[PDB]
Amino acid sequence: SHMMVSVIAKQMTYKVYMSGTVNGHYFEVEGDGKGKPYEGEQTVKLTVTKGGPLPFAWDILSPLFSIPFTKYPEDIPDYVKQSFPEGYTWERTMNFEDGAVCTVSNDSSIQGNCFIYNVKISGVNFPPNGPVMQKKTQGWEPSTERLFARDGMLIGNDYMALKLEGGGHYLCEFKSTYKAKKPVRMPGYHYVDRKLDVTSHNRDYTSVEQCEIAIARHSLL
Amino acid sequence: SHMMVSVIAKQMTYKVYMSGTVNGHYFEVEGDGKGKPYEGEQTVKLTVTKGGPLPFAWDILSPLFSIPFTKYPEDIPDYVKQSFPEGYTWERTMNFEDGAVCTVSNDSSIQGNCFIYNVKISGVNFPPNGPVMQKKTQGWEPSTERLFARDGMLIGNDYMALKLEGGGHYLCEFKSTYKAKKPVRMPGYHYVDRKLDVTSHNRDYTSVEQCEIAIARHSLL
Amino acid sequence: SHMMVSVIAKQMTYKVYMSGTVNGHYFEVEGDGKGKPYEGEQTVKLTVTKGGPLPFAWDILSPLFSIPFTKYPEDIPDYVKQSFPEGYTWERTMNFEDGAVCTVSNDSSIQGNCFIYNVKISGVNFPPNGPVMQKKTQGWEPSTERLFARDGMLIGNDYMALKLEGGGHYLCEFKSTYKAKKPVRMPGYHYVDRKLDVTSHNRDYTSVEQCEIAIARHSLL
Amino acid sequence: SHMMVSVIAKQMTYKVYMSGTVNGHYFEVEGDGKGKPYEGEQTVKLTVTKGGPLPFAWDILSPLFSIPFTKYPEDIPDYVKQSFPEGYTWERTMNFEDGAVCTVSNDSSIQGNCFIYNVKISGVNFPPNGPVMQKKTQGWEPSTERLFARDGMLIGNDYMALKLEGGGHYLCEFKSTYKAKKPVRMPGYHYVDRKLDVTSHNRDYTSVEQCEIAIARHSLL
């Protein structure tokens, strides 16, 4: 079994606060979630508190609403979990195959049994007739992030794909940079498999429930 | 002489309001500017009003503070000036050669003799020992933007370069998408030459003055 | 068990013919290999026949010397194996994180018990003091290609990483496009895990022996 | 007037030898050219000699057929002309907006009154229904290359655009790296304007004539 850290219970909740701008439209979202950090399981309920209903696909926000909830096997150092109680920050670029770009920054803290995430997203050049502004997406495929240490930062790359109405895929590249706020034991080259689903939502996606499973590992061969 | 639009005087002022995050650091800036829109000359005084003094090179913000102040020869339609009084928006990506990326959005309107600009920037993945975080930049080379029409929008690209303390250059690619808030007459493929200098600043760059000359043209050949 | 095709025996050999140019240096390589296509196992012995010894790292050529040797599970259509006897072509871009770029094209045929591969590589902008021209690489990490169907072509993306002398990683992005020469049954979204090793070589890598294991699969979750 | 190097006459000829592969199709081309190097004027007659008639737009080859024929004002050092008699090499990437990519390498020498060019191109991932494979291009816009010195090499970038049958543009980014075969005096940051036209061709573009004007300069402001 993997070393559990005492500041992170086997059952934890969290609060997430998002603000951002996508194609010039400002908006804010708040969520409360919960899960089992050492099993890699979590769920979150989101509420659009400003700028709703959103004129773009909800799916582009889904993977922005909790990386402490990743199951790590015994021999792989868990970068993110070691960073607590002080916490971590990360920065992410999303490059969509039709030219749209998002930049994302996150600050993560802990208060007792509850993680606190603050996240900002900026999105530009989503084509007006594209699957995002026309809400043609049907959730992400499961995906695998490739992670490795560099300058005491963790670096993640992920080939993502939104499912399209009536077959087809809309590609997105994730590049992520994770920075603990204190020095920790770096892991080596490894992967995290993820599966993310919207399990329920209202008509204009102003209330949304998501859930995720994330499990780290070495190569299979 | 180029046609002059009655809603834009030969001398104008403007106010610019900017908020943003760069490597996770929030900041706000306000500016007051003036110039001669049909001669392509302007100056602006900027004040950091939140999150100052900034921990990053001022030069990455410089080109975000007024495209109505571009001189257009008579035979080239002026996309930006035609958009008034309704105004315009634009979005910009900034891709630096060490992998930092900025997304920018802008909304621009007019009140009498005064343009009003609202601009938001999100910049991520500046290397902590690179010339931006170590404030080693020494202003921008004069540059040229290539512009053409597509789908009712004016598309621009610019290979920019920052000057480096100790000679040499730090490269940045600009991609811009300008969208008038009403249909306007579309120009053909053309160029805009620009020179942009910081003419004065205090020690921690919390007060900065910039001067810019911008002139559109056809190919020189 | 997966459907085996009659034109592809459980034990097969192959011949591979490479010519190319890397940083302006022309060279040619020939290899003979063998393996078990339905088990995903193969080995190949390469000989540099022109332009040797090569002034660059052998590792940049390794993943160019046999995709019929991929183990597919029963329920996933095997695009490449269906394309025979007529065969297939593919095109690949390799984008290295220090700016170097390779383009690759391949034509694959079959004669009896022996596949025949013709491959061309063009490589440019490898920095003269980089790990490639200074031969600092220490083989690839195992990796996973993400594959999906589009316009009856198969499309693969792979986040690759060369191991560096004294710790460290040198990243490379693979984008591949595979085209059967006759229509076949397209698969859905899936992955291929690969592990590629140089098992033996002489002093200046003019004779090189490699081996590979490649196994397709769905997501693990 | 700019200094004139004694090894380069006011009128010169040149031979150009080209081989390459585009979407897997091999071809060779030979050309004979002439012009006035210090005035920046040249013409060239090309003959497809293998793999003709070409199944792809001739325009993607056009800018690969002689940079000594660039007029340099007196105060800007001429990197290419100083390199002689030894000569130079260069490498170029061509990135089209629908994801096609070309890598190019060149070697250039001199025999008396005649430059000799050897050039290789590899182009991949042209979409089969795009304007290159469907021969819908109508020549290149006049363009400007940005040039600066780094590590003894002259680096160039150019936002190019092909004209499209039916108005509109198909964008391509040029990155070029020019390397003299001996140390030379390095120019500062500057530009080269170019116009390149096909002046005549037969029906299947197996004989083509091109004309190019190239003039270096500082920023216009």
Author numbering:
A (entry chain A), B (entry chain B), C (entry chain A), D (entry chain B): -2 to 62, 66 to 221
What is the paper's account of this structure, in its own sentences?
Fluorescent proteins (FPs) are widely used as optical probes in molecular and cell biology. tKeima is a tetrameric, large Stokes shift red fluorescent protein and the ancestral protein of mt-Keima, which is widely applied as a pH-sensitive fluorescent probe. Accordingly, LSS FPs are useful in multicolor imaging experiments, such as those using two-photon laser scanning microscopy, dual-color fluorescence cross-correlation spectroscopy, and FRET. tKeima is one such LSS FP, with maximum excitation and emission wavelengths of 440 and 616 nm, respectively. tKeima is the ancestor of mitochondria-targeted Keima (mt-Keima), mKeima, and dKeima. While the pH sensitivity of mt-Keima is well characterized, the pH-dependent properties of the ancestral tKeima have not been comprehensively elucidated.
To obtain a better understanding of the effect of pH on fluorescence emission, the crystal structure of tKeima at pH 4.0 was determined at a resolution of 2.2 Å. The crystal of tKeimapH4.0 belongs to the P21212 space group, with two molecules in the asymmetric unit. These two tKeimapH4.0 molecules form a tetrameric structure with neighboring symmetry mates in the crystal packing. Occupancy refinement showed that the occupancies of the cis and trans conformations of the chromophore in tKeima molecule A were 0.52 and 0.48, respectively, with B-factors of 32.17 and 31.47 Å2. Meanwhile, for tKeima molecule B, the corresponding occupancies were 0.58 and 0.42, respectively, with B-factors of 30.15 and 30.06 Å2. In the cis conformation of both molecule A and molecule B of tKeimapH4.0, the hydroxyl group of the tyrosine ring of the chromophore is stabilized by hydrogen bonding with the OG atom of Ser143 and a water molecule, at distances of 3.10/2.27 Å (molecule A/B) and 1.83/2.12 Å, respectively. In the previously determined tKeimapH8.0, a partial Fo-Fc electron density map in the trans conformation region was observed, but it was unsuitable for model building due to insufficient Fo-Fc electron density. This suggested the almost exclusive existence of the cis conformation of the tKeimapH8.0 chromophore, whereas tKeimapH4.0 showed both cis and trans conformations. Based on the spectroscopic and structural analyses, the cis and trans conformations of tKeima represent the fluorescent and nonfluorescent forms of the tKeima chromophore, respectively.
